[PDB]
Amino acid sequence: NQEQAIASYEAAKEELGLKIEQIAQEAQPIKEQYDSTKLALVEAQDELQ
Amino acid sequence: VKSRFEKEKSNQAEAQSNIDQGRKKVDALNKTIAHLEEELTKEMGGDK
Amino acid sequence: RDEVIKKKNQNEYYRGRTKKLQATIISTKEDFLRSQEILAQTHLPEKSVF
Amino acid sequence: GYTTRDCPQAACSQVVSMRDFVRDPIMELRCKIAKMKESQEQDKRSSQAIDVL
User: Are B19 and A13 within 8 A, CB to CB?
Assistant: First the structure.
């Protein structure tokens, strides 16, 4: 039963690793538009001043 | 989103730690059962 | 600040694991109580095996 | 329905409207510290009680 539990743990680990992979893949562009907005905002503030 | 990702990564790390603990424990337990199964049973079984 | 937030998240999933292990050990104590329940009936071997 | 109403709490006597209210960080600071302390004390007592058994 411990080996069965370990196998279930491994399956959960692999599926959750795929989940974190897709989460990172969708989340990196969020940081991308965050940086783009940062550059746009600072450039706008500099031009305004 | 970064907090959620690091949460999922931390859960992954904890799952890996649980897997390692379980596998090392079951390996030690299998060693113990292999050592103790034939401690005295072999003589009686072969005799029988 | 980001690393401190990460370490707070570390502390709090460690707290979650603490709660999980507390559940495990309450289960173990219930198992221990069931073990005493099994101990309640003696199952003494007979006085005249030999 | 009422432009100004008396303060329900005691130790004072005045009437205030919506716009006199402002956010008070002290209140939720107290709430957070109280919740955190009660959580830690509950965890400690439960852990010690289980250690007894």
Answer: yes
